[PDB]
Design a protein around this ligand. Structure first.
Ligand SMILES: */O=C(/[N][C]([C]([O])C(=O)O[C]1[C][C@@]2([O])[C](OC(=O)C3=[C][C]=[C][C]=[C]3)[C]3[C@]4(OC([C])=O)[C]O[C]4[C][C]([O])[C@@]3([C])C(=O)[C](OC([C])=O)C(=C1[C])C2([C])[C])C1=[C][C]=[C][C]=[C]1)C1=[C][C]=[C][C]=[C]1
Ligand SMILES: Nc1nc2c(ncn2[C@@H]2O[C@H](COP(=O)(O)OP(=O)(O)OP(=O)(O)O)[C@@H](O)[C@H]2O)c(=O)[nH]1
Ligand SMILES: Nc1ncnc2c1ncn2[C@@H]1O[C@H](COP(=O)(O)OP(=O)(O)NP(=O)(O)O)[C@@H](O)[C@H]1O
Ligand SMILES: Nc1nc2c(ncn2[C@@H]2O[C@H](COP(=O)(O)OP(=O)(O)O)[C@@H](O)[C@H]2O)c(=O)[nH]1
Ligand SMILES: [Mg+2]
Ligand SMILES: [Mg+2]
Lengths: 426, 332, 426
């Protein structure tokens, strides 16, 4: 039961998703030919959650690849795990998106969306029991932002009782990557607030900082950054696919992380994070892992958690460990840093445990934080957007596709409301 | 500003400890023990009160203010089967004619006043009728419609994009739009009410006058809300239960908005989550904004409804505290 | 004969039940297959096998899937092991209203079938958690249905209480209070522990540095065995489940025993120690050895029952009880002078290989109702108030059929209970 439909939209979403599938395939013993070559029955027990089986022990991701240009998906196909995907699950156009939310949401994306939806429907019909949908996309482009927003809206209209979660790569205010980035991000978030149950917010700046400080990586590749995201994503759903002492459903995780409908933007983190060389000075305790998880250097969103408070924190631990040791350690953390934990919620954290480590580790952990501090990120985007709007800069590209000033104003009002709500529950 | 007007209407039980008593037009007695609780609003009507009486006490003033250029909202709030639809619309084929509720009477009164005003001023009236079903919008004027959404405006109006706006010259023409739409609003059968409303009905009349030029524009919102429902009493299951879940949720956020406003009205800081539900967003101006709002709280006497009646009264009491800032919407 | 029925609901309860059944098998001489008053917990087949008079429920399949592949697997008959589709998601409103009102009927029919084996159906056992989503609402529903059907029959709840300081879920406080609202007016007796106390006991008396779920569950299993053995085995001064109801329920609403099991002694500490009866009794009455966060000095014991096992003499026990009465610190209620029931079984407890405990000739299970537990209730209500003031994590519950006044009514009920406890103490 509880099978998940995977969607990648836009370039960043598609390349991240390729790595995500590579990771999970390795985890479940699936080789690039779609054949299983694992050593444990636990490896196949819940393979249904991400894969469909075909004749000849072939396994196929229930994955949809969407793009408005062909090049990215062609590169995916050429790649090592690209031939595992079922070819009819590539849905793509040829007319470019111009980093333009309007092209993705209104015009060029509107032409392609129905064909995507039909494939979605087939996957849903092939599910014993659909749990939800996982999307990968950027916030600042045209395809991920415009197209992805569109797709999510239509799927929630069709499956309003199911889980809708996104891994969304967001702008980093100190190093912008596109000129219209604030426009694309604000337009996207304006609809993600309404039509998603949880959004995992990654900025590349934080990933670079992680790579430099802890992993001792002078030269990060996008592949390595994608690996980091992929590890988070795998960790999030481990307890749907495996046994545990205390188990976590996706809905239950939402169930523990969302005090108010709108506040579902999480900072993900991971542990352990060290170099190949700074590992022999360390041993692998639950305390050590928790310390590493609550280290600002191991956050994947662009904020100092001390510039705010955690409303709720979910930790998912993998490997054999004493529940009492874990609980006691987290209580100590709460006691010593009580000012960073909102006092409305006794037992500020949720713990989940999965009796199975990821390969080559004895212990691992994934961290999900919902902090008032992340309001600062929204502030920075809102200010960036606002200045350009004051001068109506770059606007003709969007007005030419039918978009109106009032819609933009609405988006800004939504952003400001979000930050106000965080201020209220500071 | 001006505090909202709250009225409590006591429906008659079907043909007997009441647990509710009418102290005076101004006050009521609920019978909770051991210790009493007294509630006072703007006006309380007991079981005998007629439809005409309700119109005179609650609606007539708002219609007049609408003519003067103010926005106005009347909405019925209460537990399932308390009388919200009967009050707003009336019976649905019952006695029928005299039983018609506030909406048809408002049509009649408004058009008579405008006809009287005619004797260089002109009037333009458009109507829209929509339902909020499962946090979704459906157009009662066209069954074909789909993809309706809410949008904020410079007119401060939150409106439904793509809703049919029907121009109406007379009360009779308006009646046709209402009758067709009323059939449209979704109703289902629960143990509590065979006629239970599964959506929140929003009937909107836009009144624009031109004195030639000065332009006065009034939005009149006549809202028949769905009611809070306990599953055990309603025995709602399946789709009926899904509707109940949405009804309770949107009503919960209505309560959240009303409470938050009370905090803010007194020196405090609070955020009103207007956009938590489509209902609260559309009603945003009606609650603390630029509109004269009257709330009719419908209660069933009867010991069984004690808890729900308590809840409705408590909500209404808080609502009374909210102050609105209504101005004439003018143009020169 | 006098014969019983076992129900294990929610992940935690299922886990406990596994351990319990293992213990039972080791005691009566049953294999993993079923091969060889034993019939209180094991109905015979045509030949060879014995079938645990049991029911296993969880809406998470993964829990019972684990059972279905373990060593203890073909002991169970697959009629019993029931599974759902989507889990309870730590949400009373899914366990009671939505997914509960779907499969409860099946479980009831199974229970009826099992009863139609019992000539002397003595009663039930329910294992759950004031803290799981399954165990908070579904359990209540099941109890209600059982009351509707039988009423007169004996009903027990083994309830894992929310630990005042440590907590596990984000909406443990709501769930527990909702369970209290519904279970309180059906289940005549509830035996309760929390994990914090067990952890403490493991640290101090057993010198165990790693506190984990298996050993903890084994401790609870031992208590369960001690409670039962009066039905399962011979002995002067025997006990019935109905006798517990009569003995430990002064007023019909107040029926929340604590538990404790002594000796809790490791392999070394059994030596350098005699283990006398009086000594064991003293240990049972110790503030720290109690299985919940509740100082027994902060109140008065109303009604107490003590279930001695193995090599025991009545006169010694009487002397020990006299000594305890003499002690002025351990206060009793003015109006109940006779606040002891003595239970003695010639069967000594037998401990599971690869576990915490060592052999002890003489052991006790002590079950007590006090005015002191009210503090825990008050703490829980305070927690509930603190998070209900914001009304956070409420949008999970409202969607699956709920009302705002229900919570208020529950809080009123809790207040009334507290008042009753205070009156009792006076
Ligand atoms: O990501 C993949 N797989 C993991 C694990 O199952 C696994 O085997 O991890 C390895 C990964 C290596 O490379 C280290 O990580 C990296 O250097 C890395 C590069 C780019 C992005 C992220 C990480 C590893 C490290 O990362 C992980 C993910 O474990 C970085 O900090 C941790 C701590 C580890 O201790 C470290 C440093 C190692 O050195 C370790 O080596 C040894 C000898 O123990 C390695 C791993 C444990 C490593 C050097 C080989 C996974 C995580 C979560 C979900 C699923 C899988 C993966 C899968 C397929 C192909 C390639 C990688
Ligand atoms: N003794 C013991 N307690 C446990 C165990 N697992 C969970 N608990 C306790 O049970 C509570 C959480 O409830 P769970 O039983 O895990 O939840 P559930 O009944 O499975 O319900 P859902 O998972 O929400 O469907 C917490 O108070 C935990 O401390 C276990 O293995 N042993
Ligand atoms: N004042 C009244 N006099 C006579 N009948 C009434 C009165 N109020 C309500 N009723 C009757 O009660 C039934 C309606 O319940 P209604 O008044 O429609 O409930 P409701 O509030 O709209 N229920 P719900 O839609 O679930 O919130 C109708 O058939 C009415 O005729
Ligand atoms: N992690 C990661 N981020 C990317 C990648 N490619 C682009 N991005 C980020 O995504 C944003 C740009 O959006 P993009 O997806 O390229 O535009 P689109 O193709 O129109 O959807 C910028 O913030 C980039 O830094 C990638 O391969 N990996
Ligand atoms: Mg109605
Ligand atoms: Mg569970």
């Amino acid at each position: 039961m509880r099978e998940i439909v995977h969607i990648q939209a836009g370039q960043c979403g598609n390349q991240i998703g390729a790595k995500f599938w590579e990771v999970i395939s390795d985890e479940h013993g699936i080789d690039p030919t779609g054949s299983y070559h694992g050593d444990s029955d636990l490896q196949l027990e819940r393979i249904n959650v991400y894969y469909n089986e075909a004749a000849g022990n072939k396994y196929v991701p229930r994955a949809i690849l969407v793009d408005l240009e062909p090049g990215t998906m062609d590169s995916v196909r050429s790649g090592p795990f690209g031939q595992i995907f079922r070819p009819d699950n590539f849905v793509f156009g040829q007319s470019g998106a111009g980093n333009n939310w309007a092209k993705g949401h209104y015009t060029e994306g509107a032409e392609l969306v129905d064909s995507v939806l039909d494939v979605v429907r087939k996957e849903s019909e092939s599910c014993d029991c659909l749990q939800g949908f996982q999307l990968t996309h950027s916030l600042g482009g045209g395809t991920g932002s415009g197209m992805g927003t569109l797709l999510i809206s239509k799927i929630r209209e069709e499956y309003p009782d199911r889980i809708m979660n996104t891994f969304s790569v967001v702008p980093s205010p100190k190093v912008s990557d596109t000129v219209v980035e604030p426009y694309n991000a604000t337009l996207s978030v304006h609809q993600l607030v309404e039509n998603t149950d949880e959004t995992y917010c990654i900025d590349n700046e934080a990933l670079y900082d992680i790579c430099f400080r802890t992993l001792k990586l002078t030269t990060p590749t996008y592949g390595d950054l994608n690996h980091l995201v992929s590890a988070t994503m795998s960790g999030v759903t481990t307890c749907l696919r495996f046994p545990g002492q205390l188990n976590a459903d996706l809905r239950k995780l939402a169930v523990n992380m969302v005090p108010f409908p709108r506040l579902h933007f999480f900072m993900p983190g991971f542990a352990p994070l060290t170099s190949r060389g700074s590992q022999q000075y360390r041993a692998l305790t639950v305390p050590e892992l928790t310390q590493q998880m609550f280290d600002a250097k191991n956050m994947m969103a662009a904020c100092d958690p001390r510039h705010g408070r955690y409303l709720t924190v979910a930790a998912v631990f993998r490997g054999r460990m004493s529940m009492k040791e874990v609980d006691e350690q987290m209580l100590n953390v709460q006691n010593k840093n009580s000012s960073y934990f909102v006092e409305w919620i006794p037992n500020n954290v949720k713990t989940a445990v999965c009796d199975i480590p990821p390969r080559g580790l004895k212990m691992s952990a994934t961290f999900i934080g919902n902090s008032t501090a992340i309001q600062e990120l929204f502030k920075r985007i809102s200010e960036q957007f606002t200045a350009m709007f004051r001068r109506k800069a770059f606007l003709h590209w969007y007005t030419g596709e039918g978009m109106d000033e009032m819609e933009f104003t609405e988006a800004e009002s939504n952003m400001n409301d979000l930050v106000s709500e965080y201020q209220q529950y500071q | 500003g001006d505090a909202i007007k709250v009225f409590v209407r006591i429906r008659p039980p079907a043909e007997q400890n009441l647990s509710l008593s009418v102290l005076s037009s101004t006050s009521l007695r609920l019978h909770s023990n051991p210790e009493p609780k007294t509630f006072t609003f703007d006006h309380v009507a007991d079981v005998d009160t007629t439809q005409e009486s309700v119109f005179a006490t609650v609606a007539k003033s708002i219609v007049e203010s609408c003519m003067s250029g103010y926005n106005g909202t009347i909405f019925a709030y209460g537990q399932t089967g308390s009388g919200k639809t009967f009050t707003m619309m009336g019976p649905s084929e019952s006695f029928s004619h005299n039983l018609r509720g506030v909406i048809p009477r408002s049509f009649e009164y408004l058009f008579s006043l405008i006809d009287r005003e005619k004797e260089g001023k002109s009037f333009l009236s458009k109507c829209s009728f929509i339902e909020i079903y499962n946090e979704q919008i459906y157009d009662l004027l066209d069954s074909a419609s789909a993809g309706l959404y809410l949008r904020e405006h410079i007119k401060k109006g939150v409106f439904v994009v793509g809703a049919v706006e029907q121009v109406v010259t007379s009360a009779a023409e308006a009646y046709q739009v209402l009758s067709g739409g009323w059939r449209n609003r979704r109703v289902a059968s629960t143990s509590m009410n065979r006629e239970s409303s599964r959506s929140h009905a929003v009937f909107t009349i836009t009144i624009e006058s031109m004195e030639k030029v000065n332009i006065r524009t009034s939005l009149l919102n006549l809202v028949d809300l769905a009611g809070s429902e306990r599953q055990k009493d309603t025995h709602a299951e399946g789709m009926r239960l899904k509707e109940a879940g949405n009804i309770n949720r949107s009503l919960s956020t209505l309560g959240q908005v009303i409470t938050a406003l009370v905090d803010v009205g007194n020196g405090k800081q609070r955020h009103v989550s207007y956009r938590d539900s489509k209902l609260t967003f559309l009603l945003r101006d009606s609650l603390g904004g630029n509109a004269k709002t009257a709330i009719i709280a419908n209660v069933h006497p009867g010991s069984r409804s004690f808890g729900e009646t308590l809840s409705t009264l408590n909500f209404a009491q808080r609502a009374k505290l909210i102050k609105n800032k209504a101005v004439v919407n003018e143009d020169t | 004969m006098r014969e019983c029925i076992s129900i294990h609901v929610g992940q935690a309860g299922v886990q406990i039940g596994n351990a319990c059944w293992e213990l039972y098998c080791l005691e009566h001489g049953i294999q993993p297959d079923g091969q060889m008053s034993f019939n209180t917990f094991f109905s015979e087949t045509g030949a060879g096998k014995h079938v645990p008079r049991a029911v296993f429920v969880d809406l998470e399949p993964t829990v019972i899937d684990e059972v279905r592949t373990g060593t203890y697997r073909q002991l169970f008959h697959p009629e019993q092991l029931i599974t759902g589709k989507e889990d309870a998601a730590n949400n009373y409103a899914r366990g009671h209203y939505t997914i509960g009102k779907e499969i409860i009927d099946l479980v009831l029919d199974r229970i009826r079938k099992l009863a139609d084996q019992c000539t002397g159906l003595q009663g039930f056992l329910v294992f759950h958690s004031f803290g799981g989503g399954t165990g908070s609402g579904f359990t209540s529903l099941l109890m209600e249905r059982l009351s509707v059907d039988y009423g007169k029959k004996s009903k027990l709840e083994f309830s894992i209480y929310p630990a005042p300081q440590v907590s596990t879920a984000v909406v443990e406080p709501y769930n527990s209070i909702l369970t209290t609202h519904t279970t309180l007016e059906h289940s005549d007796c509830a035996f309760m522990v929390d994990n914090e106390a067990i952890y403490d006991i493991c640290r101090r008396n057993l010198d165990i540095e790693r506190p984990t779920y298996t050993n903890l569950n084994r401790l609870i299993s031992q208590i369960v065995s001690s409670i039962t053995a009066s039905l399962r085995f011979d002995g002067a001064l025997n006990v019935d489940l109905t006798e517990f109801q009569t003995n430990l329920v002064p007023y019909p609403r107040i029926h929340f025993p604590l538990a404790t099991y002594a000796p809790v002694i490791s392999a070394e500490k059994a030596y350098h120690e005699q283990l006398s009866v009086a000594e064991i009794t003293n240990a049972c009455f110790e503030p720290a050895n109690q299985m919940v966060k509740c100082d027994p000095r902060h109140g008065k014991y109303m009604a107490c029952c003590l279930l001695y096992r193995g090599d025991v003499v009545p006169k010694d026990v009487n002397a020990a009880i006299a000594t305890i009465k003499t002690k002025r610190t351990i206060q009793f209620v003015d109006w109940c002078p006779t606040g002891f029931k003595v239970g003695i079984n010639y069967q000594p407890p037998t401990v599971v290989p690869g576990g915490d405990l060592a052999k002890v000739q003489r052991a006790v299970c002590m079950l007590s109702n006090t005015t002191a537990i009210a503090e825990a209730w008050a703490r829980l209500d305070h927690k509930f108030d603190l998070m209900y003031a914001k009304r956070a994590f409420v949008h999970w519950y409202v969607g699956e059929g709920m009302e705002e006044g229900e919570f208020s009514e529950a809080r009123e009920d809790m207040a009334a209970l507290e008042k009753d406890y205070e009156e009792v103490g006076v």
